[PDB]
Amino acid sequence: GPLGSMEDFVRQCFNPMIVELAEKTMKEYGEDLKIETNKFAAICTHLEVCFMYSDASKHRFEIIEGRDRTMAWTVVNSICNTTGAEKPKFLPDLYDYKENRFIEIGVTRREVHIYYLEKANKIKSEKTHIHIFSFTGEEMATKADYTLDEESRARIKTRLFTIRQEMASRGLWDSFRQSER
Numbered sequence: 070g071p072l073g074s075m076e077d078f079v080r081q082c083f084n085p086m087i088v089e090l091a092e093k094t095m096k097e098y099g100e101d102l103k104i105e106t107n108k109f110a111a112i113c114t115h116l117e118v119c120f121m122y123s124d125a126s127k128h129r130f131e132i133i134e135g136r137d138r139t140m141a142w143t144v145v146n147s148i149c150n151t152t153g154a155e156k157p158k159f160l161p162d163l164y165d166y167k168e169n170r171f172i173e174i175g176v177t178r179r180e181v182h183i184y185y186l187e188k189a190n191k192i193k194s195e196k197t198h199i200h201i202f203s204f205t206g207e208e209m210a211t212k213a214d215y216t217l218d219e220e221s222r223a224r225i226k227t228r229l230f231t232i233r234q235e236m237a238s239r240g241l242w243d244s245f246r247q248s249e250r
């Protein structure tokens with residue numbers, strides 16, 4: 070069985086805007102994508118989940134992820150000052166104008182409950198809502214409030230399953246799955 074290149078997979082299967090944003094994220098944080106290829110794929114995946122989440126209800130969410138860090142904080146600060154929402158310690162992924170809170174989206178190859186608990190421990194912010202997706206279709210969310218309806222979330226999970234499946238088809242999944250953290 071031939072083993073493909075992860076960089077090849079990423080460029081072939083993600084939208085080039087997502088790829089470009091992922092590249093900029095890596096360069097901004099001092100990482101070489103040509104070595105950290107699995108991480109590159111993870112960043113693309115996470116970005117795409119954030120975009121899909123926002124697109125599940127247009128005009129409802131402000132996107133924070135994918136912006137350069139300074140701009141991301143500028144947007145967070147502006148939202149806080151405008152809405153009175155409390156300022157988070159760490160950069161979140163979205164702001165929910167409807168439920169009036171920031172959202173952290175996690176995408177993991179690990180056990181969802183543990184991943185959730187780790188994120189919730191690190192945020193140190195009872196404000197930011199946490200929503201975790203795994204590639205296995207499992208999910209976990211703050212207060213068992215999943216924000217979006219089953220169909221939107223099904224769309225996200227299906228995309229994740231498709232990614233995992235294409236990766237396994239190229240022999241990329243075994244390494245990707247265990248390179249996390």
Ligand SMILES: O=C(O)/C(O)=C/C(=O)C1(Cc2ccc(Cl)cc2)CCN(Cc2ccccc2)CC1
Binds near residue numbers: 115
């Ligand atoms: O873990 C996430 O899903 C995620 O969005 C993390 C982040 O946005 C970082 C912000 C952050 C958010 C939450 C937590 Cl618990 C710790 C850090 C900022 C640099 N960011 C780069 C980055 C963005 C997305 C995916 C991986 C890395 C990482 C730290």
Ligand SMILES: [Mn+2]
Binds near residue numbers: 160161
């Ligand atoms: Mn983020």
Ligand SMILES: [Mn+2]
Binds near residue numbers: 162173174175176
């Ligand atoms: Mn996130």
